[PDB]
């Protein structure tokens, strides 16, 4: 089955970063796994097909709901960090996410309406895809680094910690 | 093939304790909380005793952590014994939990040993093996002594109180 390779590839890279960690007591990882799945779904939906228009819009929405989750959580961990460098870099990466997902919805509604239609030319259609993939890549990549920074952040917490995430590896089947 | 480069017996001991504490809810039960942290700590130990970059110092840390958590379990189990009004149960509890401070102290001492001789050439195989043997043995005795403290705590928690909801 033909899918958009970059979007799936980007989806896989976020997943790899999250998959080894447990989602219990960690909503950043939980949401990071949800977003990887959603991106994988979107990689199939961009190929057109029956029921695509609606699903591709509702998908971008679900990627936006998950974006906000990640962002909010990453601010609370940043709030508790005692290292300024880690605190700055985490905020810098995560504060860009909302904008990116907002653009992703806009371009998703664009691509959603373009599907099926004939009057839409090739260049216009292809360009609409390349804009969607560009932002998708930037979303996944931004979220990916936000997890890494949040791991670092979680080492340098103040002992009077208000908020905290649980960082524990998942047990292998053969452990 | 193998899957993990670890000391399997210590992973078992860890999992045995984790299977006990997992049954119960930590919410109103610091014993369970401590216990769950001890299982995870002892699981990490089963990788650190193999070695690699950063292990010597982590094994020292991990051992200190296990010691801290051990003391909590001991202190809590004592309070439970005070309330209990059944002779057998309150005795058998105290006959288990009071071992934990000792077993812990030995675990730190041996952890420091085995940490020192990781990545080091001037150490015989006999000495290396016997260090690992005393370590695993103490590590297994710890997990067992804790596991039975958790069990004796609830059997005594017929009623400081604790919460034993599944």
């Amino acid at each position: 089955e033909v899918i958009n390779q970059p979007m799936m590839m980007a989806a896989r890279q976020l997943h790899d970063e999250a998959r080894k960690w447990s989602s219990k007591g960690n909503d950043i990882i939980a949401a990071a796994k949800r977003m990887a799945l959603l991106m994988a779904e979107m990689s199939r939906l961009v190929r057109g097909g029956s029921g695509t228009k609606r699903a591709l819009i509702q998908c971008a929405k679900d990627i936006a709901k998950a974006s906000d989750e990640v962002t909010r959580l990453a601010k609370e961990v940043a709030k508790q960090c005692t290292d300024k460098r880690i605190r700055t870099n985490l905020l810098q990466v995560c504060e860009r996410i909302p904008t990116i997902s907002t653009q992703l919805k806009i371009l998703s509604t664009v691509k959603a309406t373009m599907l099926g239609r004939t009057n839409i030319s090739d260049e216009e259609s292809e360009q609409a895809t390349e804009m969607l993939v560009h932002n998708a890549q930037n979303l996944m990549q931004s979220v990916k680094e936000t997890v890494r920074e949040a791991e670092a952040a979680s080492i340098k917490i103040r002992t009077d910690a208000g908020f905290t995430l649980r960082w524990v590896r998942k047990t292998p089947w053969y452990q | 093939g193998s899957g993990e480069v670890i000391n399997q017996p210590m992973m078992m001991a860890a999992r045995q304790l984790h299977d006990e504490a997992r049954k119960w809810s930590s919410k109103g039960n610091d014993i369970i909380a401590a216990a769950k942290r001890m299982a995870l700590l002892m699981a990490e130990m089963s990788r650190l005793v193999r070695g690699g970059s950063g292990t010597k110092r982590a094994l020292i840390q991990c051992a200190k952590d296990i010691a801290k958590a051990s003391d909590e379990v001991t202190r809590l189990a004592k309070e439970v014994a005070k309330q209990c009004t059944d002779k057998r149960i309150r005795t058998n509890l105290l006959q288990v939990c009071e071992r934990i401070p000792t077993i812990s102290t030995q675990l730190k001492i041996l952890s420091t040993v085995k940490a020192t001789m990781l990545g080091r050439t001037n150490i015989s195989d006999e000495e290396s093996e016997q260090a690992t043997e005393m370590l695993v043995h103490n590590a297994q005795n710890l997990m067992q002594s804790v596991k039975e403290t958790v069990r004796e705590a609830e059997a005594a928690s017929i009623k400081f109180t604790l919460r034993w909801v599944r």
Partner: peptide, 13 residues
């Protein structure tokens, strides 16, 4: 890489 690597290097050197 970024801050997470820097902390892992610190703990392994």
């Amino acid at each position: 890489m970024d801050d997470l690597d820097a902390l892992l290097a610190d703990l392994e050197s």
